[PDB]
């Protein structure tokens, strides 16, 4: 999308392959704010908002928290409390066309600044003079939306950077999007510290003949202690027994 018509998609109810994006490294700028590139990225996210817009290379710096500029104040504002990553990568082959591609537009002037998630699609001509414009473009009336004009042979500062702003809030109570969570392998027949789906315990794993219902993860026998647990890695039910101990 163009910068003025910033396109939003909601990433909901899916696990996310955060690690592979880092592995790709096709992005020139990876300035992440608040979440950082860490294990914190690979954890529960309430909502994930993806925003795409093709901007100038020089204006990439502007779309950072607490920064000001034309793109910042007239096209897409930035949350000062932004928790998220800003990616810019060169689209010179893809988004530059011979003789210029004049389809991506930007708002040079606007009446006031914009809210952090403001999508102004208005075509009303900006007025800077005592004379009302009345829909005719003249002196004291200059069209707000101007065409950047990316050219194939131009500096990278004057070449397109596709930007996919990814907003992640850190409360994580809904947890609609989560990371892979680094599942391990099975090591049964020895005393081990087990943590199948969130219950830390100590004991030895063995094959279980119990048939758990599909909505049940772990099982408790008489006197309210864990007896069998189903690992969701391969929907396998395993019997937990304490490893050998006794007096001497």
């Amino acid at each position, epitope marked *: 999308a163009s910068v003025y018509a910033w396109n939003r998609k909601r990433i909901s109810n899916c696990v996310a392959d955060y690690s592979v994006l880092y592995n790709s490294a096709s992005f020139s700028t990876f300035k992440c704010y608040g979440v950082s590139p860490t294990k914190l990225n690979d954890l529960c996210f309430t909502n994930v908002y993806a925003d795409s817009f093709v901007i100038r290379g020089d204006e990439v710096r502007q779309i950072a928290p607490g920064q000001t500029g034309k793109i910042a104040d007239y096209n897409y504002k930035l949350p000062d409390d932004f928790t998220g990553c800003v990616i810019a990568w060169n689209s010179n082959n893809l988004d530059s066309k011979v003789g210029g591609n004049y389809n991506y537009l930007y708002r040079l002037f606007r009446k006031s600044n914009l809210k952090p998630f403001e999508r102004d699609i208005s075509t009303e001509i900006y007025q800077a003079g005592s004379t009302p414009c009345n829909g005719v*473009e*003249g*002196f004291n009336c200059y069209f707000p939306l*101007q065409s950047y004009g990316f050219q194939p042979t131009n500096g990278v500062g004057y070449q397109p950077y596709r930007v996919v702003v990814l907003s992640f809030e850190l409360l994580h109570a809904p947890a609609t999007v989560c990371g892979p969570k680094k599942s391990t392998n099975l090591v049964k027949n020895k005393c081990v510290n087990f943590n199948f789906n969130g219950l830390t315990g100590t004991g030895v794993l063995t094959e279980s003949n119990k048939k758990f219902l599909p909505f049940q993860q772990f099982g408790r026998d008489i006197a309210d202690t864990t007896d069998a647990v189903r690992d969701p890695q391969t929907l396998e039910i395993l019997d937990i027994t304490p490893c050998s101990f006794g007096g001497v």
Partner: antibody
Amino acid sequence: VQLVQSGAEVKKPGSSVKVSCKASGGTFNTYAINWVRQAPGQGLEWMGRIIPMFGIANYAQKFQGTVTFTADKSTSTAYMELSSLRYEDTAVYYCARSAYYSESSGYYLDYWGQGTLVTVSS
Amino acid sequence: EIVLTQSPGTLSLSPGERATLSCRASQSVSGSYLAWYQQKPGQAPSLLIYGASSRATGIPDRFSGSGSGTDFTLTISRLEPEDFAVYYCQQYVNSPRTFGQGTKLE
């Protein structure tokens, strides 16, 4: 670069007509399209402009409610519709292109079409 | 709304000397948003100048503007017989952009 339009209209009075100015490749998106009446044996009158990309048409006080401007993003063709043929509506309509962008000198009609003749007959 | 009156309305014959055909407006043209046009008989107008003096592609620099405020000059080095077209003025300011009445109409 070349803006072939309609040539002549055979319209009995009160019967509507649509003009078919054709924009060349890259003309519609970059430049707006303007319409000029050019009444017979008289001067040039600016009817209005079509901004094709955003579909915005704004008219002068005189022609408001009597003429309709439309443009087709696909096939790059500019259209002007006359509501009905009033007796004075006879003319040689012209289509021309200007640049909305302020960063390049614009709003002046760069290039013009051949002209569309509306009359009582041929 | 802005009005324009061209002053040398008609020159019947071609003596070939330079003519300083003019345009005047009720409110002074702001930022020199005026353009001249060449309308040869039987054909569409062609842009001749823009701004106050900026020339045009494919039109020789013999055509010279010399205006400010109430922009009022379009001059030519010599008057060619073939190059005898009605010349129009259109403001491109926020007003209705209504052309003048023409300065070379036979």
